[PDB]
Write an enzyme that holds these catalytic residues in place. Structure first.
Site, PDB file in Angstrom:
ATOM      1  N   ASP A  95      67.113 -67.820  38.860  1.00 30.76           N
ATOM      2  CA  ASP A  95      67.234 -69.223  38.364  1.00 30.76           C
ATOM      3  C   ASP A  95      66.626 -69.293  36.954  1.00 30.76           C
ATOM      4  O   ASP A  95      65.418 -69.785  36.839  1.00 30.76           O
ATOM      5  CB  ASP A  95      66.576 -70.250  39.269  1.00 30.76           C
ATOM      6  N   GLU A  97      67.264 -71.562  33.574  1.00 24.56           N
ATOM      7  CA  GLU A  97      68.123 -72.785  33.200  1.00 24.56           C
ATOM      8  C   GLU A  97      67.793 -73.023  31.690  1.00 24.56           C
ATOM      9  O   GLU A  97      68.228 -74.164  31.483  1.00 24.56           O
ATOM     10  CB  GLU A  97      68.148 -73.693  34.268  1.00 24.56           C
ATOM     11  N   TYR A 168      71.937 -68.423  38.927  1.00 24.68           N
ATOM     12  CA  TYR A 168      72.100 -69.888  39.468  1.00 24.68           C
ATOM     13  C   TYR A 168      72.945 -70.366  38.619  1.00 24.68           C
ATOM     14  O   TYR A 168      72.704 -70.535  37.195  1.00 24.68           O
ATOM     15  CB  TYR A 168      70.993 -70.458  39.538  1.00 24.68           C
ATOM     16  N   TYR A 211      76.575 -79.664  42.556  1.00 26.79           N
ATOM     17  CA  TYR A 211      75.779 -81.063  43.127  1.00 26.79           C
ATOM     18  C   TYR A 211      76.404 -82.328  42.734  1.00 26.79           C
ATOM     19  O   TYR A 211      77.152 -82.419  41.562  1.00 26.79           O
ATOM     20  CB  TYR A 211      74.335 -80.987  42.519  1.00 26.79           C
ATOM     21  N   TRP A 285      70.550 -75.937  49.032  1.00 31.54           N
ATOM     22  CA  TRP A 285      69.541 -75.756  48.333  1.00 31.54           C
ATOM     23  C   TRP A 285      68.674 -77.277  48.661  1.00 31.54           C
ATOM     24  O   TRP A 285      69.210 -78.265  49.061  1.00 31.54           O
ATOM     25  CB  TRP A 285      69.462 -75.707  46.875  1.00 31.54           C
TER      26      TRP A 285
END
EC number: 3.2.1.35
Length: 314
Positions: A95, A97, A168, A211, A285
């Protein structure tokens, strides 16, 4: 085969006697042994190593000023600490970002990476013409952006070779953005994903984040998911070297309404879109902040048994 993975941090509820056995026992979701957060089915590494980032500039701020060896040494220790079994066979998720490795995609809140890149070139070469400065800034950022991401992924794969690794949220899509209001991904981004074979041929699994946003129509929420899952499947079938798995990252909260649980209607239409398009499963998640008290654990368990579990099961 279609595999749904539990990546919600319900380990935080075990102290209250809530072990969430129904995830795997009733709903057929793949669950790490003893409902551990990191185990044989899946393990996510949050901001591992010391990736250059602007938080203050951490390890250079932009990748072209970063110390790679320092980052890889820290990354190795983080990976070993969190995934001690060398034979880890699950889904390994990095992950990261901070910034996108494509200079152009560092928009809005990521704009400071573009600015710092140009500032550094200007300071070093004050008499270079502006086109040369801009070109150099982009080139150096992308060169070292790639180095940091590719080397980290190579290290993870070498250290834990039985697992399927990926970052991710890649590939990105940017659908339902201003500039790109429809559900289709931005065209330039599609082209940039196509030229990012250095990343996608090395990854074992693609993990687009799908999402949902509350400020969208029901059809637009399905479109958001669809566009992103299609982008990952194109790239997964692209790739010259291999056949990648596609496991979208799915959250049970709205990204723009973070305390609001997804409606049943939204769960049904979007989970159906993921399966209908041919993804290999999906990863559910959760954030630690949403289940760090007994009452939050019980409310989440109620949502799981009332709506999320049933929808996932079928």
């Amino acid at each position: 085969e279609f595999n749904v993975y539990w990546n919600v941090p319900t380990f935080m509820c075990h102290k209250y006697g809530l072990r969430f056995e129904e995830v795997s026992e009733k709903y057929g979701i793949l669950q790490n042994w003893m409902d551990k957060f990191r185990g044989e089915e899946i393990a996510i590494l949050y901001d591992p190593g010391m990736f250059p980032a602007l938080l203050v500039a951490r390890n250079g701020g932009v990748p072209q000023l970063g110390n790679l060896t320092k980052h890889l040494q820290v990354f190795r220790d983080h990976l070993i600490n969190q995934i001690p079994d060398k034979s880890f066979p699950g889904v390994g998720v990095i992950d990261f970002e901070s910034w996108r490795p494509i200079f152009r995609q560092n928009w809005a809140s990521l704009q400071p990476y573009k600015k710092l890149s140009v500032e550094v070139v200007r300071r070093e070469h004050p008499f270079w013409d502006d086109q040369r400065v801009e070109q150099e800034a982009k080139r150096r950022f992308e060169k070292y952006g790639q180095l940091f991401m590719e080397e980290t992924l190579k290290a993870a794969k070498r250290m834990r070779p039985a697992a399927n690794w990926g970052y991710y949220a890649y590939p990105y899509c940017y659908n339902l953005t201003p500039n790109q209001p429809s559900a289709q991904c931005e065209a330039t981004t599609m082209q940039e994903n196509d030229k990012m074979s250095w990343l996608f041929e090395s990854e074992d699994v693609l993990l687009p984040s799908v999402y949902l946003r509350w400020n969208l129509t029901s059809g637009e929420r399905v479109g958001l998911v669809g566009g992103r899952v299609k982008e990952a499947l194109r790239i997964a079938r692209q790739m010259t070297t291999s056949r990648k798995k596609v496991l979208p990252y799915y959250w049970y909260k709205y990204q723009d309404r973070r305390d609001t649980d997804l409606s049943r209607a939204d769960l049904e239409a979007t989970l159906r879109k993921i399966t209908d398009l041919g993804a290999d499963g999906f990863i559910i998640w959760g954030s630690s902040d949403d289940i760090n008290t007994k009452a939050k654990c019980l409310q989440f368990r109620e949502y799981l048994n009332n709506e999320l579990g049933p929808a996932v099961k079928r």
